[PDB]
Swiss-Prot record, chain C:
The keyword Cell wall biogenesis/degradation does not apply. It holds the Pfam family Cas3-like_C. The keyword Methyltransferase does not apply. In the N-terminal section; belongs to the CRISPR-associated nuclease Cas3-HD family. In the central section; belongs to the CRISPR-associated helicase Cas3 family. Interacts with Cas1. Gene3D superfamilies: 1.10.3210.30. It comes from Pseudomonas aeruginosa (strain UCBPP-PA14). A motif (DEAD box) lies at residues 423-426. It is an enzyme of class 3 (hydrolase). NCBIfam families: cas3_yersinia. This is CRISPR-associated nuclease/helicase Cas3 subtype I-F/YPEST.
Amino acid sequence: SNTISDRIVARSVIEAARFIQSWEDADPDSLTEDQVLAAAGFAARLHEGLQATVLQRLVDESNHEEYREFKAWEEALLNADGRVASSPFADWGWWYRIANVMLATASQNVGVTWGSRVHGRLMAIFQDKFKQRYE
Amino acid sequence: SNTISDRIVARSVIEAARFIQSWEDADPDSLTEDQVLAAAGFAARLHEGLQATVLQRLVDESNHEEYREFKAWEEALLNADGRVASSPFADWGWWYRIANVMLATASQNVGVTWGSRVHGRLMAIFQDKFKQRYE
Amino acid sequence: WHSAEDIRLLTVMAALFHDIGKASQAFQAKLRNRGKPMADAYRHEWVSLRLFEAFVGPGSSDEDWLRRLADKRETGDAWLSQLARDDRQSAPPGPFQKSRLPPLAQAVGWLIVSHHRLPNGDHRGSASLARLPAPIQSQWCGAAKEKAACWQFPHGLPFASAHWRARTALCAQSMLERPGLLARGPALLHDSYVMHVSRLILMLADHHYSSLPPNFPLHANTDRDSGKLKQRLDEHLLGVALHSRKLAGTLPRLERQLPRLARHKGFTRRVEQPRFRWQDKAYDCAMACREQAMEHGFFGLNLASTGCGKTLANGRILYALADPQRGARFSIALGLRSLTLQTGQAYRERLGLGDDDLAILVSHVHFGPLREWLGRNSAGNRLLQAPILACTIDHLMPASESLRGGHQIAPLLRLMTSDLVLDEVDDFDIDDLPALSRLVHWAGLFGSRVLLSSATLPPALVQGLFEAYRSGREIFQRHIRCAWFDEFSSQSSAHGAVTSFSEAHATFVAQRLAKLEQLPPRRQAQLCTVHLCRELAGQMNTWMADLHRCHHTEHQGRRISFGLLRLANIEPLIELAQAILAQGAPEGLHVHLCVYHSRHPLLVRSAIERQLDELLKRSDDDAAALFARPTLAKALQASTERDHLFVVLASPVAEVGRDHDYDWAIVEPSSMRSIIQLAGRIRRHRSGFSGEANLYLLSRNIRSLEGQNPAFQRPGFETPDFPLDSHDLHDLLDPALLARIDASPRIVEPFPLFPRSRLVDLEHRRLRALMLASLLGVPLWWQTPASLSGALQTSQPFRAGAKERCYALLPDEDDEERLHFSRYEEGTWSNQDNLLRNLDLTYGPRIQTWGTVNYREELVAMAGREDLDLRQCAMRYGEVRLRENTQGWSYHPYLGFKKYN
């Protein structure tokens, strides 16, 4: 199970479906404006839900698995917001994990397995769109 | 938390989004064919995932909350498949709970709170479409 | 082959039915379309079934329909007219639902209905399942205005074609001629063996037709291989019929034709060497069993004691089974999820059998009656041809129970060919064992006798195994004596009734129980206490320090011991390993650690297993030889310190498989099975007991230290509903169990247990809540036309719980020297890079690793031995199975893959 991702994706279904359907044919080397917007819109919705979960402590601290997995998201947030570091785009940091959730969404809904070309293009979009989401 | 619903909805995002977007304006007293199809398609996807979870025992029996909530879904299935009863459309039975998941999906994604008119119309659609889903 | 002529006729109907189902235009449009891909529409097989139904009914006597078919002139307007449309509107009578076809016709429809998939039904009712195939409706098909369009766009059905019509007429005439055949066929359709045979025949012919390259309009799919559509459906029907003719002939052929391994010098010969007596006795019983057994079938139990190597006994049974003709055929199916090349190789070495003689199913099989239909050079065919095939139980089980596809067909054919041997571990939970029993039952009926080496088998499970063959025997005779191998003696019972078999089981159990009652020569049980991995880890280290001093070998002033740390789950083992790495060895000691589990890539894991096997052979006065042996020599040269501990930290698969004898072990408890395996390892090869403790057991399952419940699961005999009152281990195991711990506890047949009174007791009860005793009875499945549907399988699924896909460290398509973590998709791999995190492990003072593997070196070795490209061959040989996890894995060369959190 990946219960934190499921909870956030399940509250992002409109954005998730729009992203999956928009990127079905996508060439990451030549994205349309609508493909960029669909990716940014899904990432922004995931970000909003994940930030809320972390800041509000929406977690069962007695659940050994859920609490550890929450702490990894919290660690990523602290490595983005300056409390531990200010590097939101670092490998395995906040936006990298959001890009991974987007890859997971495609895998678990339509059976497509995207790799470095898609993941790197997502990270480039996030760098362009979301620099101001953290100080 | 409602972890079983989240897991199933999170593997049904395309159907969930189609249903939410189709029913945004819907008058349950005069549905279009496309609104009926969007509801039936989401319900069928939820049904497939929930039946798989129950029959395959995709659950942690040591999790006091998850196991009890799994058992309620299992009880509903046994009250539909003949092992306990053959009444899939009874109040609080299998399809009634699926209609509730669809109401929850709208609440938790777009903040809309549907009531008896929508829920009863869903149950009528399910009666028309899914009589053969159980013996 | 009494039923063969009828089977062939039935097979010859099905392709024609399928083409007819094919006809509606929507399908033609889809073949035309290329893209975007169209929905179904409603399965083609289902449409064909409707077409078959429409001509005949309703309601027509089998004879009348055959007469219409057999006569050339008709017609064919009324038949063309007849078929019902579900749409326009709402309900239509379900085909075969009632008062429809003559039953033979229904069987034909099922055969036709079957090919796309086995039927699926939402209803789980027991009564409905027994009736089958009557309940099969829209849900079974798995399939509107689009449907009407599919029916329409037309144009021109079969029975217009000159060649197709004539063949059908001839078939009808043959059906009319065949004495007694129609009525019998109508009653029979239900019989499981017949249904299975028909399904098998249909899959192969269809595959052959698909493989092969005048005015007719209707047609088969194209686009995957050359654009546009190729061929015509009717030609396809003819081809299917031709194949059907040929498949029946081949089945009749195989026993004399089929590749067999026979008359091996070693298996026949008695074993001079000490401690081989039980196998010899079992072999001698073999002649009597064979005389009884071939005519009547064979159900054997090799219950030779755990911690004693099994190869000889199984080999003897196989040799015993056929003599001297048709030697030799059998398959050794191991109860592991994955078979490594090394394990198979070891089994082969045991049997003194050439690799070509023995095939390993690793799916690549390492080394034609079905050859003409079959691929000339293909793995499934190779597995069939080999005199013995090695692979595992799970794949065969999946083939026997398949939701869909030819692969199911090949698997069934494989199960069919001579007789399938299990190993014990597979059932796991009284229920999973029940699914295994169902597969075994389906298997016997094909006529293979399967022998179970029940070192740890519960009596009830054995009874269930005995029953399935019994149903199978009834099927098989139309188309039982059990021998208990023992070190002391083997007893064979020729018993008609399962209950009779059980008592015979009880009697056999009594003698074994008496042997157990003799105090065990080898094995001490320790109850200790853990004060999470690190807290446990320290305790484990203390235990290891204690055991080596107690149990070690000295040569020329130095002392070496070998220990086993068994953990239940990969993550916990990884944590323990990490704790060990940060900490050193204790003062004065050198610790060598080898991490062994199922996570690691398959080639590397196999290499590690082979190294362990080479290291862990133990013989009397073998300490000096061990010192001489290269790893030992290296350790001695390397470091001044006298005292060396070579230690394997392992999971359940390693525990389950490996002929390794260990000086001591520290074991995390998962059940009677964990205990038995540990005891065998504890005394693999060496006579005599110090009488000091050499085996240490822990208090609450690691989940229990977490406090997770039920404490024993995954694998736990315990289930949440069947709760055990007290978590603690010390209460759970009886003082007698504690002393001279031996299978005896498992072998019973122990009454009367208290739900929370005995951990073993709990296991027996759960296992029975499994078997004959949300529980669709296995007996019910045996009784009824389960074979028709996939309902029983859906009810009790094999490999329950999510299954990880399959991944590998792949050398890049362009550059051999760069590696990418990759996921197998569907005939190709997607970039893994993004997700997977790679982690170093710190090394403790006076600590190092052993039995490790460099991945690049392993790949090079694979390339050298198999003449493959590094990337392709390393794929082939470098898969690791993993439950999908969004953020990926950490990877360390020694430790394999661990999740994230």
